[PDB]
Design a protein around this ligand. Structure first.
Ligand code: T9D
Length: 243
């Protein structure tokens, strides 16, 4: 993972994106489903197979807000900087705050809404690095990209960002295999109830989040299903902050 000085620079470049990542980490950690949804898990809190969730919950509770972490601390917050450095580290991707200009663009790409939908409070774009970025464009070849929504409980988004959407392979289920997506945000939103994020977040403590996926083309509103995880990636996050 990045060292502290590098993490401080990365967080300073985009405080809201860094905050989002700390918020989604807190949501996955605080969930009763932490065992399955906090993946990836920070290795410094694991003894081989044994994940020390109580030590991690305690240290997450001691994190100051990101403004305090950056503006004073250098060696005032050793454990905090170790954890936040890990949260903000990835060789695969990074996240960028985007403007309400970008929400219009998302509507243009997904379709004019058939149903009234709320505008997100925050919008983020995921940028992929190689090899994952080149691999996705290799898989795409000349096929078109379509943009579709996938709602989920807040405590799944740490895993969704780092691992992609779960593409279930269970012929043993009512819903069968695949990832469900829709071009109607009002249908995706039903799958994105408010959850608890981070009490020290710039975004606010209570968030809903909807993924916008890039899919390689290959009443109620209409949904579709993708069974091959190489054919989609999460490209945007729509974040709604409860008032
Ligand atoms: O955003 C989403 N987040 N998670 C789930 C999900 N999704 C939509 C569904 C519609 C219907 C259905 O029902 C089955 C269909 C087969 N037969 C038995 C019932 C399951 C769905 C799961 C969506 C969406 F809208 F993008 F697709």
């Amino acid at each position: 993972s990045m060292g502290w000085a590098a993490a401080r620079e990365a967080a300073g470049r985009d405080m809201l994106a860094a905050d989002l990542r700390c918020s989604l980490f807190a949501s996955a950690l605080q969930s009763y489903k932490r065992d399955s949804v906090l993946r990836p898990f920070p290795a410094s809190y694991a003894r081989g197979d044994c994940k020390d969730f109580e030590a991690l919950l305690a240290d997450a509770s001691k994190l100051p807000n990101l403004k305090e972490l950056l503006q004073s601390s250098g060696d005032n917050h050793k454990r905090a900087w170790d954890l936040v450095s890990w949260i903000l580290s990835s060789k695969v991707l990074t996240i960028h705050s985007a403007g309400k200009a970008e929400f219009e663009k998302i509507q243009k790409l997904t379709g004019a809404p058939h149903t009234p939908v709320p505008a997100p409070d925050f919008l983020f774009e995921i940028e992929y690095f190689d090899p994952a970025n080149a691999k996705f464009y290799e898989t795409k070849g000349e096929r078109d990209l379509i943009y579709a929504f996938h709602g989920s409980r807040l405590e799944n988004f740490h895993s969704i960002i780092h691992n992609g959407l779960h593409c279930h392979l269970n012929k043993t289920s009512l819903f069968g295999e695949g990832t469900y997506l829709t071009s109607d945000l009002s249908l995706a939103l039903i799958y994105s109830p408010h959850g608890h994020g981070w009490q020290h977040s710039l975004l606010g403590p209570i968030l809903s989040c909807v993924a916008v996926c890039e899919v390689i083309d290959h009443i109620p509103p209409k949904y579709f299903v993708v069974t091959n995880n190489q054919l989609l990636r999460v490209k945007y996050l729509l974040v709604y902050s409860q008032k």
